[PDB]
Design a protein around this nucleic acid. Structure first.
Ligand SMILES: [Mg+2]
Lengths: 191, 139, 195, 348, 109
RNA sequence: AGAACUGGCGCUGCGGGAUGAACCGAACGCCGGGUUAAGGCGCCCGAUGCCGACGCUCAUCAGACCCCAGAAAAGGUGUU
RNA sequence: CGUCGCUUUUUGAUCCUUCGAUGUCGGCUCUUCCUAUCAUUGUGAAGCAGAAUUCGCCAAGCGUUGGAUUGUUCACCCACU
RNA sequence: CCAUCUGUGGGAUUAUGACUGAACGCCUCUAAGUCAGAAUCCCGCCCAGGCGGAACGAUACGGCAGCGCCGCGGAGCCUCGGUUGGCCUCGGAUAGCCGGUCCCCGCCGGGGGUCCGGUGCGGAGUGCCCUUCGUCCUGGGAAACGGGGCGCGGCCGGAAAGGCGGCCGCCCCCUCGCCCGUCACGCACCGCACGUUCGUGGGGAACCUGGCGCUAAACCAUUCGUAGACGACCUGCUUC
């Protein structure tokens, strides 16, 4: 079709300041900073105006699979804005039958050492992506909490745990055992 | 990023084609790759030139959407594009590119003798600034 | 005498056909840094048809027969050979004017390198489509010299900064020197006829 | 077409050109990786296999049915007199592989090293290194000799060590040194290279390179058997007795339409004398041989903590086809490639 | 003192695909790479200079080992600045890729 | 396998279809210049090295030229 | 009940090639290839509780035997796997 | 296997499960961007080492001979091809280029504000020599390093194929190594081709020709048996 442009904008609150080197975006905020390069995605970005901080992503030329990626851009900025002010917290809970899951942390809140999963002798050590924090819950049974700024480093690491607790050579519809994610939240609440 | 657009009234240079080397005024974009243009004060009349033919310049003209030749003629010489186009650094480069093409054999000799002269002058002078640059760094 | 082609950013087939014609016309052509030649189509696609190339193997003894080269220099060399009449002695002599080098050797690191804008990826592919590097489909297929080459590139390119850093030192100087004019009698005739 | 009965391949195609190998001394195809943090050390060593005996050891392996009992094991013993380091080779890497940078040899080299550099030592005037020794002592040749270690230290990334064997200490009639070139895999290259200038023309024992119960590899050239037929070279099934023109032959050496004899078929040629590398041969004992004459040399090999005799590992009557061992030795569990009196390079 | 001739390589014989024609050569005169700008070189005498081991000259007073085959530029050949020339003998096919020597002689400029 | 009608091959080369009995151009004394048919013009391989026009399509088995040398029903929120 | 295909390991149909000759069944022996996968790796689905099975996916790396009868290919049986 | 011993790990990923996430305001493993993933695949380990290369040793006396290196002039023999060199940033492409005050890496590099330019003119559509016919007379402008070298001495840079480059002190020497102007001369060979360079090229044979050096080793024959069809292969041969 080759339409004339589309554009979404992303409003920026005051404690976070987005600066851009190009199609690379640098996001500094209160609880750290993080950056993403979009040198594959063929769009211009424009932060415009002092004292209000609006980011304008627009694509002038394009087709229907090139128009679909202008929202994917602006929805990745809002995960960089939300994660650098609030952060991400994926609470996940252990579900077990007869055998209780023994889950500890070896290395400074990075390595996760899972044993006594389904009565097996084999420990399952999970080393995580750099930028998340491991923490066994308090005032709750068998809950594991991951905290960090960047969603794709939180969420991929929360996927490695759930994938490691995979029941093999069995009926997966019974034998419902695993450390499944149960909540998608923030580190700081209600801002 | 994208500091100059096409637009109703945008002055464009025409690089190749049947009107190669003349300015035009973009009047109406017609479909996606073809634009209605004219130049009333630069000897190119009204037609649809393709966009890959043209070169965007940085002069805009505030005339209405798809007017006649007359109002574009008024806006061309109210804004006085032709003196502003001569007094730019890019039409000096296309002026300079044709002066070098019509350089005769006798002038090309005279350029050669006056080129190899002044490059002696700088080389016998740029050596002096090297000579004083170590003389700072020797104490 | 001899032209020197930097090979990165170029396409495999678009560059090697232009090398194949310029080498039939008597020139001596040297393509340098043929590690980063791009090749169209995504990487898993092009890695398939190179693995299909590896099993084209004569049954009775694979020692004689198809010689699968794996360095991206000889990948590029073999592409030129299929666009030459190499079974004739005019096509044999055409290959002897081609000398292809991976990385940048020291006879050819201080020359000025040329590019072919016919064959560039920036020119010729639509930017929203995927391409493959010849360096890492060589590395995926038995080329065991990627690390020892990419070490010698950054040893090469670090020595090339300190040359260019001091070059723009030199031409800041002869531009500061030509401010000290004293010569505008000679500046008449060049600006008159394109300085 | 579809054989009716599946059998596997006779022989391995991984060792295919069953060729007389181009070397009598085994070449190390690939040295062990070297890291700067680990101490500085050699990696291989030359030895001469002398024969086999067996042994009696107390096994200790929990879980098995043998645990805490006596087991006999067949062991080979390899007489390894201490090597003498002679030269230092550096290798700088290219994108065409490793390349020899340059070599520096010792000041005065031995006489049995020089015997390696000649195919006719008797008809010779022995003139090797006579002009190369004079540069260690003439000072103009010396202040550039130290220059070639500093350019060695700067550029090349893996350095090795040229050593040879002391063939004066063996009962063989050979007297030519076997000149090997082995790799120092220690720390960084400056400590790796000052570790070799310090010990040119000095001996390197075997217990300094290897250790007890430190599992190594044997590299050798196999027992050469000559030009032998199909059923012995490849262990192919013999034909039944009634067969005209021949029993011990492979019958069908291929189909019709490939129309050529394949490489993958078994036929007659040279068996043995091939280069092979064994993997995972355990060391049992590093013995030392035939010490001082102050009181007595002391034979005292093969005297374990339960035997306590004046034994020595050379058996009663001397080794068959080898001689009588007077040197430092290594004993290795299992069979080991080669005839007796044959060079084979032990390697980590 | 200096070069009074423009450089050109002998690219091949005029040919179809299978059969080739020996009587007409074709050239790639250097620096000219379009059919519109080849009109200068038409009619120009062009030469193929080579060596042997016996001797001949016309003007030099002593015969040297250099000898030559003359010939002239006939017409244009396709859209890309090629040029076909018809010499007085045929080129020996040793000359493929080697230069020839295109003079400026029969001048209308 | 067997008929009809016209042409062809057999008796017949040449250009094009990579290769070829019959297909498409086209028929032949020995040559020079000119031009074309059928076919083509990234490089083998003569000629697009045109600032060619407009769209369509991404394949982890793409596709690519009469005869002609490989495929169907059915299905696809893949795009148009 | 229909109906659309593929393959040339069956048999036909054909008679183009070989009648101044291409040695004609099977077995033995040995190599290599194909996948339309029996097992083995990693998986998805069951009317998958477990165990055993069954249906599908990437997949030909590796294996797929010993005998009684019979010229047998095929068949049938004993036994292991 | 009728005795004994040994048999070796990485990468990208297939199937498939997923991550964020649009298209389609939600959803969704996908469209761009990610993760895990295997008897398959490629490599390692291992077997052979290319009309593929390195590094190093030794380089022929005797009695006349002989052989390298450097410095040479002198001819003829054989193979021909070219007619000025560019001596270097990295790269990006919905982007880059130059100059720049301020705070950080043993008197140099990392950053940001600022100023420029940009169908790139600090433009290989370009740049430097140059289209140098020579010299003499003879003035202006430009320039006080001289520039070639058989110079001698010195340094230190460039290992991926360094086989090249930069700097310095003395020196027979030039003080005409440029641009404009004055003066008159040279083969002015009588209209004409292969001219003009790289080039005192490449390769071989010899001779008059200065200095500096150098004084071996392969193969056979003999022996060995770690080897063997034969060749090949591994070895010995001192007046102790
Ligand atoms: Mg190796």
């Amino acid at each position: 079709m080759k339409t004339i442009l589309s554009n979404q904008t992303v409003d920026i609150p005051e404690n976070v300041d987005i600066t851009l080197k190009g199609r690379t975006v640098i996001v500094k905020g209160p609880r750290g900073t993080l950056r993403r390069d979009f040198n594959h995605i063929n769009v211009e970005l424009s932060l415009l105006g002092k004292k209000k901080k609006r980011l304008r992503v627009d694509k002038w030329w394009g087709n229907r699979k090139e128009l679909a990626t202008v929202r994917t851009i602006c929805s990745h900025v809002q995960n960089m804005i939300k994660g650098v002010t609030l952060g991400f917290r994926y609470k996940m809970r252990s579900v077990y039958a007869h055998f209780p899951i023994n889950v500890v942390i070896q290395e400074n809140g990075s390595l996760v050492e899972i044993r006594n999963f389904l009565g097996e002798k084999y420990i399952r050590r999970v080393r995580m992506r750099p930028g998340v924090a491991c923490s066994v819950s308090q005032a709750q049974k068998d809950e594991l909490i991951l905290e960090g700024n960047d969603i794709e480093l939180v969420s991929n690491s929360a996927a490695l745990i759930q994938q490691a607790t995979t029941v093999k050579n069995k009926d997966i519809r019974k034998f419902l055992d695993g450390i499944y994610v149960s909540e998608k939240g923030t580190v700081q609440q209600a801002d | 990023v994208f500091r100059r657009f096409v637009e109703v009234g945008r002055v464009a240079y025409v690089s190749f084609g049947p009107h190669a080397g003349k300015l035009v005024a973009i009047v109406d974009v017609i479909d996606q790759n073809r634009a209605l243009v004219d130049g009333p004060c630069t000897q190119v009349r009204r037609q649809a030139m393709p966009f890959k033919c043209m070169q965007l310049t940085d002069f805009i003209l505030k005339f209405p959407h798809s007017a006649h030749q007359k109002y574009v003629r008024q806006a061309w010489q109210k804004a006085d594009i032709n003196t502003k186009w001569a007094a730019t650094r890019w039409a000096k480069k296309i002026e300079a590119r044709e002066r070098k093409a019509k350089m005769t054999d006798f002038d090309r000799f005279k350029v050669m003798k006056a080129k190899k002269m002044r490059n002696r002058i700088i080389k016998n002078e740029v050596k002096k600034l090297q000579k004083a640059a170590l003389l700072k760094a020797s104490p | 005498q001899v032209l020197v082609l930097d090979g990165r950013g170029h396409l495999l087939g678009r560059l090697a056909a232009i090398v194949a014609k310029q080498v039939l016309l008597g020139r001596k052509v040297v393509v340098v840094r043929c590690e980063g030649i791009n090749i169209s189509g995504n990487f898993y696609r092009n890695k398939l048809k190179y693995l299909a190339f590896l099993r084209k193997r004569m049954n009775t003894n694979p020692s004689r027969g198809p010689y699968h080269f794996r360095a991206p220099s000889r990948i590029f060399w073999r592409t030129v050979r299929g666009m030459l009449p190499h079974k004739t002695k005019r096509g044999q002599a055409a290959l002897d004017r081609l000398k292809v080098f991976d990385g940048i050797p020291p006879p050819y690191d201080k020359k000025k390198r040329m590019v072919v804008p016919a064959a560039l990826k920036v020119v010729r592919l639509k930017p929203t489509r995927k391409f493959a590097y010849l360096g890492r489909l060589a590395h995926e297929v038995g080329w065991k010299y990627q690390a020892v080459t990419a070490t010698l590139e950054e040893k090469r390119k670090e020595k090339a900064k300190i040359h260019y850093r001091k070059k723009k030192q030199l031409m800041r100087l002869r531009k500061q020197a030509e401010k000290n004019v004293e010569k505008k009698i000679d500046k008449y005739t060049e600006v008159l006829k394109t300085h | 077409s579809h054989r009716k009965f599946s059998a596997p391949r006779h022989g391995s195609l991984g060792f295919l050109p069953r060729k007389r190998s181009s070397r009598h001394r085994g070449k190390v195809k690939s040295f062990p990786k070297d890291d700067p943090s680990k101490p500085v050390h050699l990696t291989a060593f030359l030895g001469y296999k002398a024969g086999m005996t067996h042994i009696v050891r107390e096994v200790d392996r929990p879980g098995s049915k043998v645990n805490k009992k006596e087991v006999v094991e067949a062991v080979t013993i390899v007489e390894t007199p201490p090597m003498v380091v002679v030269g230092i080779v550096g290798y700088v890497e290219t994108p065409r592989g490793l390349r020899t940078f340059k070599t520096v040899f010792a000041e005065h080299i031995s006489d049995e090293c020089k015997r390696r550099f000649y195919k006719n030592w008797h008809k010779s005037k022995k003139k090797a290194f006579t002009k190369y020794c004079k540069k260690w002592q003439d000072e103009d040749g010396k202040k550039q000799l130290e220059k070639d270690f500093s350019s060695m230290k700067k550029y090349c990334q893996v350095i090795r060590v040229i050593a040879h064997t002391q063939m004066r200490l063996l009962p063989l009639r050979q007297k030519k040194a076997h000149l090997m070139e082995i790799q120092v895999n220690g720390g960084t290259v400056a400590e790796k290279l000052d570790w070799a200038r310090e010990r040119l023309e000095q001996q390197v024992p075997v217990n300094q390179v290897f250790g007890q119960d430190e599992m190594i590899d044997v590299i050798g050239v196999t027992k050469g058997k000559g030009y032998k037929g199909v059923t012995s070279r490849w262990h192919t099934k013999k034909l039944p007795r009634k067969t005209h023109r021949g029993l011990r032959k492979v019958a069908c050496i291929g189909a019709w339409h490939p129309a050529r004899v394949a490489f993958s078929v078994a036929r007659a040629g040279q068996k043995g004398y091939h280069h092979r590398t064994e993997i995972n041969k355990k060391i049992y004992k590093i013995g030392q041989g035939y010490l001082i004459k102050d009181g007595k040399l002391i034979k005292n090999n093969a005297s374990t903590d339960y035997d306590l005799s004046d034994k020595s590992i050379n058996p009663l009557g001397g080794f068959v086809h080898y001689g009588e061992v007077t040197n430092d030795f290594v004993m290795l569990k299992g069979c080991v490639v080669g005839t007796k009196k044959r060079v084979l390079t032990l390697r980590k | 003192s200096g070069r009074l001739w423009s450089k050109a390589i002998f690219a091949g014989y005029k040919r179809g695909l299978r059969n080739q024609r020996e009587h007409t050569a074709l050239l790639k005169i250097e620096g000219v790479y379009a059919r519109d700008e080849t009109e200068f070189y038409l009619g120009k005498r062009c030469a193929y200079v080579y060596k042997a081991k016996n001797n001949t000259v016309t003007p030099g007073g002593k015969p040297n080992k250099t000898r030559v085959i003359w010939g002239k530029v006939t017409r244009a050949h396709g859209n890309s600045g090629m040029v076909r020339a018809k010499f007085r003998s045929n080129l020996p096919a040793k000359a493929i890729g080697h230069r020839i020597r295109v003079m400026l002689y029969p001048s209308r400029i």
